[PDB]
Write a protein that binds this ligand. Structure first.
Ligand SMILES: C=C1[C@H](O)CC(=C/C=C2\CCC[C@]3(C)[C@@H]([C@H](C)CCC[C@H](OC)c4ccc(O)cc4)CC[C@@H]23)C[C@H]1O
Lengths: 239, 11
């Protein structure tokens, strides 16, 4: 049932993810240091973390089968709109339900509600984000499923500004069908029960998170002294 | 477009 084209897709995506996701988190040392101790104390560190994570999401995206047949303008629009969402999705790998934190290997790099709050965010974003993390983590995805969902998130044809939507859809459709078929052949029940649908629902939850994030961004953004603490990439991508 | 860094990282 899983064709050779579909096995190839999955193998490309697993490797691309491995090339762009370091589970030792060694590069975190290059970020401006976190400060816990002060309302925006964590902002430099998390801005840096986000900025790096944008870079890695781009590196992953470039490797998506089909992505390179898209025009530059379309590449750009897909990345601008999906970046935060893929960062949210990829963060699930460090997210632990033990204490509802993202644990990047050491206490310095273990982030919780109060760390995020000290980056200029409120429960308007954080509560539904931790709920996302929890509900995503409970799906217990195979890594194969994880990378397919991130790819499907990026190659989304309804993002506004998209020119060649039909091309975006054919690409996305190839990855949806690979994901559908993978779950059927490799995901045993009961974990497979309604699993595609539950994954598609998470992409819907990410639309709402993206919305709220863009709103908090605009607010922070309006204060030139905080906007100063960001990075040039983050300013370019998040506007 | 005015997205030079993102253009550059995509090429
Ligand atoms: C490498 C990894 C590891 O898994 C660690 C990782 C964690 C991600 C986290 C845990 C920490 C908090 C993160 C970064 C979330 C927040 C909302 C991002 C805040 C930083 C962002 O700066 C660009 C921002 C945006 C608007 C603001 O008003 C203030 C700050 C988005 C996703 C959240 C991301 C992933 O790329």
């Amino acid at each position: 049932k899983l064709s050779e084209e579909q096995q190839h897709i999955i193998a490309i995506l697993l490797d691309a993810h491995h090339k762009t996701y370091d589970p030792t988190y060694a590069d975190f040392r290059d970020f401006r240091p976190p400060v816990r101790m002060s309302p925006l104390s964590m902002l430099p560190h998390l801005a840096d973390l986000v900025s790096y994570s944008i870079q890695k999401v781009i590196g992953f995206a470039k490797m998506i089968p089909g992505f390179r047949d898209l025009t530059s303008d379309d590449q750009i629009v897909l990345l601008k709109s999906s970046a935060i969402e893929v960062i949210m999705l990829r963060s699930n790998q460090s997210f632990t339900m033990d204490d509802m934190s993202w644990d990047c290997g050491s206490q310095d790099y273990k982030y919780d509600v109060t760390d995020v709050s000290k980056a200029g965010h409120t429960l308007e974003l954080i509560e539904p984000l931790i709920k996302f993390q929890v509900g995503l983590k409970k799906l217990n995805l195979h890594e194969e499923e994880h990378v397919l969902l991130m790819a499907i998130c990026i190659v989304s044809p309804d993002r506004p500004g998209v020119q060649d939507a039909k091309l975006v859809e054919a690409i996305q459709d190839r990855l949806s069908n690979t994901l559908q078929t993978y779950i059927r052949c490799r995901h045993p029940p009961p974990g497979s029960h309604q699993l595609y649908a539950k994954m598609i629902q998470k992409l819907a939850d990410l639309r709402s998170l993206n919305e709220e994030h863009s709103k908090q961004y605009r607010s922070l953004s309006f204060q030139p002294e905080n906007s100063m603490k960001l990075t040039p990439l983050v300013l370019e991508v998040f506007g | 477009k005015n997205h030079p860094m993102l253009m550059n990282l995509l090429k």
